[PDB]
Design a protein around this ligand. Structure first.
Ligand SMILES: N=C(N)c1ccc(C[C@@H](NC(=O)CNS(=O)(=O)c2ccc3ccccc3c2)C(=O)N2CCCCC2)cc1
Lengths: 29, 257, 10
């Protein structure tokens, strides 16, 4: 219910952080 | 954090700093799971073998920080503890099993651009994210090196540090310690033939090991910085508290209903 | 290091 996990300056601003992709790619290896 | 990087501003809004009153010093890392609750490692508050045993009045909680040393007046928020809860079966005698602890803030904190809670995982999430090979992120203000030449530098960072490490196969974890690891732990880090390094370190304890869900775009706290043999050593990995398994206890303590 | 926080907390 309560929102969580959505960074106000990132997710919510449609921006991504510098090494975030390294996380994401590790899934689709 | 060994071999990490400066985090960007507002990159870990759920990152909490455990501050000691007197002497004033950085005790540990922690995470904001809500408006009034903070999740940290037990060993940050209690470890008899070193005469460690903090109480509600010995600490402070500082949320919304970037800089390690500054007093970020406009952005951070300083809270007082109302009550601390340590896992009844925290084994500080042999392996730090169930190294978990909750702290209840005196007054709720106001979320902001700098202060936001992380999510706790559910059965499916844990099930699909906690897989060997998958990368997690660790953050903190701990040591930049396991050891270093005194007075020639500064073992500590100026701003919050961040590192992304992969989850290691249980067997590989088991064979790296003489310690008796349990199902309430997990290990992460690169392998010697992997070509990369990284680790958490003293001062990083209690910090959160988070993971991002590609399907919902949210960050989940899967682990807690627990223990390690040195910092960034080859053939050694970091051990994290398995948040998902200890979730019933969290549930039991919180009492949202 | 540390900059000093308000003493009310200390
Ligand atoms: N990822 C890492 N490299 C890492 C992670 C956490 C830390 C901080 C952590 N220190 C250590 O784990 C030091 N490693 S240790 O000295 O090998 C150690 C010491 C005591 C132990 C007791 C039970 C189970 C494992 C143990 C491991 C700490 O403050 N503890 C409180 C006192 C007990 C041990 C943990 C250090 C390094």
């Amino acid at each position: 219910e309560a929102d969580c996990g959505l960074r106000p300056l990132f997710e919510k601003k449609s921006l991504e952080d510098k090494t975030e992709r390294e996380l994401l790619e590790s899934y689709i290896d | 954090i060994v071999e990490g990087s400066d985090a960007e501003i507002g990159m870990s809004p759920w990152q909490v700093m455990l501050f000691r009153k007197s002497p004033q010093e950085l005790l540990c890392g922690a995470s904001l799971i809500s408006d009034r609750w903070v999740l940290t490692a037990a060993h940050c508050l209690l470890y008899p073998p070193w005469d460690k045993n903090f109480t509600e009045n010995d600490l402070l909680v500082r949320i919304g920080k970037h800089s390690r040393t500054r007093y970020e007046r406009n952005i951070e928020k300083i809270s007082m503890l109302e009550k601390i809860y340590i896992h009844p079966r925290y084994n500080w005698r042999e392996n730090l099993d169930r190294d978990i602890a909750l702290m209840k803030l005196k007054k709720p904190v106001a979320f902001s651009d700098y202060i936001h809670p992380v999510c706790l995982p559910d059965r499916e999430t844990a099930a699909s994210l906690l897989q060997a090979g998958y990368k997690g992120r660790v953050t903190g203000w701990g040591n930049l090196k396991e050891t270093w030449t005194a007075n020639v530098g500064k073992g500590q960072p100026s701003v919050l540090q961040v590192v992304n490490l992969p989850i290691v196969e249980r067997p590989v974890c088991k064979d790296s310690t003489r310690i008796r690891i349990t199902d309430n732990m997990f290990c992460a880090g690169y392998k010697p033939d992997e070509g990369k390094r990284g680790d958490a370190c003293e001062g990083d304890s209690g910090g959160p090991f988070v993971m991002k869900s590609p399907f919902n775009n949210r960050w989940y706290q899967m682990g807690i910085v627990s223990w390690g043999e040195g910092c960034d050593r080859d053939g050694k990995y970091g051990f994290y508290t398995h948040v998902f398994r200890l979730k019933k206890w969290i549930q039991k303590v919180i009492d949202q209903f | 290091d540390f900059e000093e926080i308000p003493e009310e907390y200390l």
